Amino acid sequence: ATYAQALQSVPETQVSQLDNGLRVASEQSSQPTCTVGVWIDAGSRYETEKNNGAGYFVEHLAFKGTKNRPGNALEKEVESMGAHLNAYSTREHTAYYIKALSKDLPKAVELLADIVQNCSLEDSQIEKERDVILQELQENDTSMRDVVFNYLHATAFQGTPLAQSVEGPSENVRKLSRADLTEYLSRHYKAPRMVLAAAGGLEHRQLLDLAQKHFSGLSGTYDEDAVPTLTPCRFTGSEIRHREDGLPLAHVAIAVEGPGWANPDNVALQVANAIIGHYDCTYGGGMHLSSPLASVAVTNKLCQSFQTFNICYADTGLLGAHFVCDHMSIDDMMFVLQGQWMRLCTSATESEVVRGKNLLRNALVSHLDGTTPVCEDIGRSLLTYGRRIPLAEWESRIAEVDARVVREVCSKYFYDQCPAVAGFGPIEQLPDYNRIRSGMFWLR
Amino acid sequence: HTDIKVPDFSDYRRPEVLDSTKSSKESSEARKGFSYLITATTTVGVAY
Amino acid sequence: SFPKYEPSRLASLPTTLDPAEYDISSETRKAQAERLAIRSRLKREYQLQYNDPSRRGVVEDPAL
Amino acid sequence: KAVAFQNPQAHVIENLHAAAYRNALANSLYCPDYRIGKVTPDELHDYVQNHFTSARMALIGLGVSHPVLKQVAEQFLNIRAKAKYRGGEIREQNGDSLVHAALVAESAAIGSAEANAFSVLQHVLGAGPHVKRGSNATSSLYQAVAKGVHQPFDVSAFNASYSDSGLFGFYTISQAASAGDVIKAAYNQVKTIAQGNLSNPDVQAAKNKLKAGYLMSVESSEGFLDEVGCQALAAGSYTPPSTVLQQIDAVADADVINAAKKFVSGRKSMAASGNLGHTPFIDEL
Amino acid sequence: INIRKTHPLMKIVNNAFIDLPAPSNISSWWNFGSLLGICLILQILTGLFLAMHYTPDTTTAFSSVTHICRDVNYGWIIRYMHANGASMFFICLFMHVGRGLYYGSYTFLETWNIGVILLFATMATAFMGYVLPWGQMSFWGATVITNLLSAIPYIGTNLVEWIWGGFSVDKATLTRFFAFHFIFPFIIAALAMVHLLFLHETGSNNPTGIPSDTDK
Amino acid sequence: PTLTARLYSLLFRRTSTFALTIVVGALFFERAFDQGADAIYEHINEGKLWKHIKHKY
Ligand code: HEM
Ligand code: HEM
């Protein structure tokens, strides 16, 4: 019992500041399994046109040999102690992390330091990995949901560098030199911006001392003060439609403005997307789901799937919906989705907000379990928010939100906004832009 | 497929939205109000 | 706190709030280095043909 | 059924299980192709009244207290074979430019040090790539075929443990007209491993691999739930994971080479699928 | 889902006037169908108020039209609007005919036949309404055109005696023409719906004549 | 331009508020515009109508 009192039984993340400027943070939790990770603010947003896709290429060549343990000895030690190496990169973040055991922590931090600060590139490496990325683009031209997200960011952040792709275009990939790689490595693998964070059964002193013995000596000064700095860009609102009829299903992504990070409208719109949420076509209780979009869509056989969702970047983002449906069903699914949005805008009752609170709490707690997602929580917390936000804070911000504030926020950020439609597939029936906009503001 | 870039609409954009670096939140109400005010004056004339 | 200083054909945009001066890429460092080099060489040619004690006439700028 | 089986590996594993045993373990999880729209609820009633008895059930609680659980169990829940090996193969000519070949003998049931020997053996042989975009410096099968064939391929070992029987083997994805080389190279590697050419630090490395995998299946409460429940039904007695690892690394390569010697000694079964123009049958091996 | 595709009136209207897939490059000349429709319903309205203020007899006709143009207020603009609305009707009508001849839209066969039936109907309506004011030009145009109908031998003479209602242009001819100038535009409106029916079935026409079913 | 933005925030956000806005606007401009139109029509003659010489008799 006493769910709030049980939420006070959650440990706190120690935050400390290595003398290079490096943010280190640890959550000593109650398990023999540890996750140690590095989160780096070097996405794709910090790039030129000619450095497009350099970061993806770096992440490929992050694990392929260094000046210290050349060639494959990195991987050999990983498979020696049975380490579990993993990495990902987004448009705004880039992370390398390691799932391992409570006792190999000095050797794992040695591995991670040799990944980051001593990455070295070679000619056989650059040629072979250029061939590898040509294989990966040519075999992920057909990853359809990825193509839809590419189109959505490209059409909603036109002109600004946020519309660049994570891999870069092909004609910036097949001609990169090592010099531009070294420039990117030099200009974005810097000490103060990045976070070393561990989550598991280990004390903060051990982590601080190992970071002192290895991360003393990466960086701290730029190449003649060529400081990368954010620009709060502009959300255009448009549609790009890729008519390609030889495909079985059609994908639609509809999106509007992102609220940002530090505003609490972040949390309230996450409550609205808890109400709307996601349906996939493989459920039980299909005729009786509480989510009204999925209830109408199942009973009238509209869509294969939807996820109705949030994405935030620095002072911006895409608040939106994705749905996949058959080429003779797009219009009515579209109509019911705008109907759900406007019903939340003007006629938000109380019980549906209570259901949103239940869904958001359960999704938040279920997302924050397992050592590695909690370490990713801490990494994105100390990057964006600049602190590990506690979950009693999330309890406070949930309890400080009722039906009135929800319909206020959705009247602000949805009602008669200029959307962005990225449609891919057989979408000749997908309605024209003016009737989407006329479906936004509704007279009735 | 990643080489899908938009051709730039700098010939067509409004003077508030020619800046591809300033945010378009505080530029929204005036632009939408001006379009809707032209629709309103049209509706006034038709109703007369 | 401020409507961010719309420019004109008369009101110059001052040195401070560009805001292009804070996105220093390596290309701007390269351009500022070469621009200083051009100004260096032109002041060198000018100063040597400016301080000649035998030089009676004017220095005869090709720019003008 | 269509949504689940759109991954090829579900069809491959199911055709291997339909090739595995001669009996009820060859039945799918999924409904078969023709029964969709033919079965009645009376089998469902009878199936619940003869298999969902109180004598067959494990109730696990996390986040609860003990006596609440015990009382609601005592108020509501007081309401009341021997599969044989088969031998053979199943070929699934389908044509996706991806030869999927799983090659499996019969190994051991759950809960034996023999089964632990098979597990440390398959981590010696090959498993999931521990490095993202990796090159598998330790998976010796991948070593032998990367020595052999310079193509897109992927080789991984395979354990299907059961309460009574078990399956050991491996699983290979390759191109169409290059699969015979891959299967022969990997099988000659398994031969020269089962000869006895397997060393002690490799044994310790695989011990640490299996210890890592077993501690990392039970990180969250879900895998913890999975382990505890499958134990408490499979055995009726909880065991801490630390002493499980102690019982694991108590073994040596004695049982490992004995069990790999059983596998090369074992009468093979297999399942292949895809464009199979150059596929070894059994006899080419 | 949506009342706009469940309610059966709105099924026909939503597949006629809302979600109608016209091609994308319509020029100025395809407005004239809607203009003919609007001219027609304005004709019907102005004629209705005219029919409320009019006494049709050869003794009384010009007296009554004068009475409308003086005493019943705004009836002067009702009269003038009916006359010049017939004028703008025929200007828009020859533009619509000329468009259909010009851009090769005359391939749509039974639409085009329905068109020619509509053209004769408008000509008959305009003729009879122009008889109606019962003035000098009215009278002699009437006598000329009726004996032009009598030019056909052996039945057409008796046919003209029949459509007279008399042996000359009499009061009976005046009320026959009043009744038909009333009742024909309703037939024109219904056949306009038939014209639009066949057009929605067969498909519209772009300016370039290209089969334009890719850019609706 | 914010005067048009605050006009959007006051009178163009809601539907029935927009309708009542154009009601009040059409009525007041109807009154004042008919006054101005009759003023222009008398200004363009100033000596020809019946009203001024009917009251100066
Ligand atoms: C069914 C609806 C209509 C009614 C009830 C109607 C009624 C009348 C009446 C009472 C008149 C005599 C008024 C006058 O001539 O000063 C008239 C005149 C006339 N009508 Fe119609 N009319 C109708 C539709 C049309 C249509 C569709 C046309 C063709 C566009 C048309 C063409 C004329 C013409 C040309 C005149 C003679 C105008 C004149 O000489 O002043 N009418 N109509
Ligand atoms: C009673 C008068 C008539 C009316 C009210 C009328 C009305 C219309 C309307 C509303 C359209 C559709 C316009 C569009 O889609 O842009 C149309 C189309 C058409 N009409 Fe008529 N019509 C009339 C007489 C005629 C006549 C006499 C002809 C010639 C025989 C004709 C031939 C056509 C053709 C060919 C089209 C197709 C336009 C295209 O897609 O190019 N109509 N009409």
CSV table of C-alpha atoms in Angstrom, one decimal, chain A residues 300 331-332 335 428 435, chain E residues 1-2 4-5 19 213:
chain,number,residue,atom,x,y,z
A,300,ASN,CA,-15.5,-0.1,-38.6
A,331,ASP,CA,-9.9,9.1,-45.3
A,332,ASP,CA,-12.2,7.8,-42.6
A,335,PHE,CA,-11.5,11.8,-40.0
A,428,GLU,CA,-4.3,9.0,-53.7
A,435,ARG,CA,-9.6,19.8,-46.0
E,1,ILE,CA,-18.1,7.0,-38.9
E,2,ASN,CA,-19.5,10.0,-40.7
E,4,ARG,CA,-21.7,12.7,-44.7
E,5,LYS,CA,-21.4,9.1,-46.1
E,19,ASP,CA,-16.0,14.9,-53.1
E,213,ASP,CA,-7.2,10.9,-64.2
